[PDB]
Amino acid sequence: MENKIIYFLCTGNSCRSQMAEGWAKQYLGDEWKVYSAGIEAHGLNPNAVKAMKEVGIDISNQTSDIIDSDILNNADLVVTLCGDAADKCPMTPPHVKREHWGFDDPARAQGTEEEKWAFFQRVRDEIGNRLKEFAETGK
């Protein structure tokens, strides 16, 4: 096996990590077995689904799950997206390369549901940008 594997992790596998897997599937051209997880999973957020549909991507296909050994110890890279109001930062194996791309969870962008939705499209777009640079530039 020489296809890469990559993992995106959050406080819960419902927003940032779900969306990041969505973008990563596009830019990484599936040359990297893309996955996402978190400290918990209860399904993906309806606004995350809308946010990805607003760019012509789907994440409905990748219904959430908690961290699993078959990816945590096997991913060529793991990324934690913790930079939000809870900031739990899911634990990783020390043997594996890690990145930290902290930004606030759009479900926690408190103000009103319209402001939360506006933060879903903002966090989506910023994730997309950094995934582009990760694929294109290696940043």
82 sits in the region (left: phi over 0; alpha: psi -120 to 50; else beta) called beta
Domain that holds residue 61: 1-139
Q: What angle do CA 78, 93, 5 make, to 5 degrees?
A: 35
Q: In what helix (H) or strand (E) does residue 132 lie, and over which residues does it extend?
A: helix 113-136
CA nearest 25: which of 55, 70, 66?
A: 55
Q: At what angle do helices 113-136 and 16-27 cross, to 10 degrees?
A: 40
Rounded distance, CA 37 to CA 129, Å? 21
Rounded distance, CA 36 to CA 81, Å? 11
Name the pairing type of β-strands 32-38 and 77-82: unpaired
Residues catalogued as catalytic: 10, 82, 89
Tell me, what DSSP letter sits at residue 107?
A: G
Rounded distance, CA 52 to CA 57, Å? 5
Q: Which CATH number belongs to the domain containing residue 117 in this structure?
A: 3.40.50.2300
Per the structure, the count of domains in the chain is: 1
Tell me, what DSSP letter sits at residue 108?
A: G
Cα→Cα distances 24→15, 95, 113, 130, Å: 14, 23, 27, 10
Say if CB 84 and CB 63 are below 8 A apart.
no
Q: 3-state secondary structure string, 12-47?
A: CCCCHHHHHHHHHHHHCCCCEEEEEEECCCCCCCHH
